[PDB]
Paper text:
Caspases are cysteine-dependent aspartyl-specific proteases involved in a range of cellular and disease processes, ranging from apoptosis to inflammation and neurodegeneration. Caspase family members are broadly classified as inflammatory (C1, C4, and C5) or apoptotic caspases. While often classified as an executioner caspase, the function of caspase-6 (C6) in physiology and disease has remained enigmatic, and it has been suggested that C6 may act upstream of the other executioner caspases. C6 possesses a non-catalytic cysteine (C264) not present in other family members and is situated on a loop in the small subunit at the distal end of the active site. The catalytic cysteine (C163) is found on the large subunit, while two additional cysteine residues appear to be buried and thus inaccessible for disulfide formation.
One successful foray in this vein produced analogue 2a (R = p-OCF3), in which the nipecotic acid core was reoriented, with the piperidine nitrogen displaying a vinylsulfonamide. Analogue 2a, having the 3R configuration, exhibited markedly superior C264 engagement compared to its 3S enantiomer 2b, with a mass spectrometry-based dose–response-50 (DR50) value of 0.08 μM and a C6 inhibition IC50 value of 0.180 μM, indicating that inhibition by 2a involved both molecular recognition and reaction with C264. The crystal structure of 2a bound to C6 confirmed the covalent modification of residue C264, whose α-carbon atom moved ∼2.4 Å toward the substrate-binding groove, compared to the structure of C6 bound to a VEID peptide substrate analogue. Informed by this structure, we explored new piperidine substitutions, seeking to engage additional pockets in the active site. A complex X-ray crystal structure of 3a showed similarities and differences as compared to the binding of 2a. Both analogues engaged C264 in a covalent bond as expected, while the trifluoromethoxyaryl side chain of both analogues was buried in the S1 pocket, where the aspartic acid residue of the C6 substrate is usually bound. However, the location and orientation of the piperidine ring and sulfonamide function were quite different in the two analogues. Lamin A cleavage was inhibited by 2a with an IC50 value of 14.2 ± 2.4 μM and by 3a with an IC50 value of 170 ± 4 nM. Importantly, 2a and 3a inhibited lamin A cleavage in a manner that tracked well with their biochemical potencies, with 2a roughly 50-fold less potent than 3a.
Author numbering:
A (entry chain F): 197 to 291
B (entry chain E): 30 to 176
C (entry chain B): 196 to 292
D (entry chain A): 31 to 177
Write the structure that this text describes.
């Protein structure tokens, strides 16, 4: 067979791209974990996990800062970022 | 045949461990803001990963020594009968570091424990890191498509 | 339709290697990563979702090893590429028109 | 909310694929020549042309020339294009890519195509492909515990 790189088969899922702030709703948690969990609830046991993370990018991209003591932050945005060193399709079908 | 539809083998006895490091407050001398709502995030992830068959192990406001001991321990147990590994950090960060309660830790130290040469029983298996942390001090700005 | 977009959304950053690592080459036919990317584009570019295709590129580059080097410690060494997605939708390059 | 949603790829043109191909460097950079990059550039040109891209290749541009060319492409109309591809075949250092004579921050190059700078690519994919070493560690071979 072929050997693998010791760094293969990692998936790094970040709330934001390097350089940017991440955001939260006042009480119910971060934008990113709320939207990740909603997508896990609806699609986690069927969709390929990177397809699911792409839906999370779309969902978080719809959010905006509604309330902030800094008025320059109002209306500001976030897109998450996932970095894949995966080599195969990843599914969490029911066991 | 190189099969473009090839899936990771996910029919092991166990899904595997989902580790969650949940950081709400920090050592006063770090002058880091409280992460109000992180307990909702931790509980939401616990439910969703449990529903996907993970053994969820949550740790709240660990200090650097405690967090390193715990993650090193998980890296040295057998994952031979597991599909995969998930590790979640809910905290502040700085560059390529994540904050424990008292101090920051290089993210490469944490992922390094699960690389193929350190963690033989996860070779060929997905290692999934999920990091909720700001990664700089710029706010992204809103745009709309032309038309 | 109803929502604004982040100015940084809908980027895809495709790297030959993860941060911190050397990338490799054959030298006649070029880099491991561009050779395997181009082979997958040739076979699957017009049908597969582009991140699905990049995942096949990760698998193909992961199969390679350093066979010849003046540094003998480099023999058998390895590379995995890395793609970073801020995409919000599926990306296909179906034939135009 | 449709989980199978695809980018709109039915515009008149696929769009531009920009390729910055760097084989040799200003002698005072002490950077090794990139023997084989010619093969990579030609291979990409064929594959992207076959996918409908207008491929525009530039060999061994100096920093000023590279910035002028990429700024030009960021300020033309992509209203009738599906997407944008940009390829760098060069050496890098941290979050920099090398032109012939000097390094350039990758964020300056991607930044030109952000939605607030490039209105006609808003809602469209921007794809950056970078063939460059990203440090001085060789990854090591491992085998799954199963075999
Ligand atoms: C109104 C303040 S803001 O929106 O301009 N912004 C300032 C920069 C930091 C941002 C922030 O607080 N981010 C954040 C903190 C904690 C998080 O986790 C959570 F607490 F669990 F939700 C997520 C995001 C705010
Ligand atoms: C035997 C030398 S090695 O394989 O250990 N290795 C040392 C570190 C750098 C590696 C290398 O040359 N990588 C590389 C150079 C140039 C590239 O572009 C290309 F020339 F177009 F292919 C790709 C990869 C060698
Ligand atoms: Cl998707
Ligand atoms: Cl963002
Ligand atoms: Cl800002
Ligand atoms: Cl091994």
């Amino acid at each position: 067979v072929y050997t693998l790189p010791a760094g293969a088969d990692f998936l790094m899922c970040y709330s934001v791209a390097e350089g940017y702030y991440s955001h939260r709703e006042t009480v119910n948690g971060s934008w990113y974990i709320q939207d990740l969990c909603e997508m896990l609830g609806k699609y986690g046991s069927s969709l390929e996990f990177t397809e699911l993370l792409t839906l999370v990018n779309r969902k978080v991209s719809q959010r905006r800062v509604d309330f902030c003591k800094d008025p320059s932050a109002i209306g500001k945005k976030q897109v998450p970022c996932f970095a894949s060193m995966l080599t195969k399709k990843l599914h969490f079908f029911p066991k | 045949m190189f099969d473009p539809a090839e899936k990771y083998k996910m029919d092991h006895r166990r899904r595997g461990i989902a580790l969650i490091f949940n950081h709400e407050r920090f050592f006063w001398h770090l002058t880091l803001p409280e992460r109000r709502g992180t307990c909702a995030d931790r509980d939401n992830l616990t439910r969703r990963f449990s529903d996907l068959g993970f053994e969820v192990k949550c740790f709240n406001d660990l200090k650097a020594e405690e967090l390193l001991l715990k993650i090193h321990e998980v890296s040295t147990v057998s994952h031979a009968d597991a599909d995969c590994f998930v590790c979640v950090f809910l905290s502040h960060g700085e560059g390529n570091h994540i904050y424990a309660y008292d101090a920051k830790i290089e993210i490469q130290t944490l992922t390094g424990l699960f690389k193929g040469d350190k963690c033989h029983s996860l070779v060929g298996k997905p290692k999934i890191f999920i990091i909720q942390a700001c990664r700089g001090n710029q706010h992204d700005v809103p745009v709309i498509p032309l038309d």
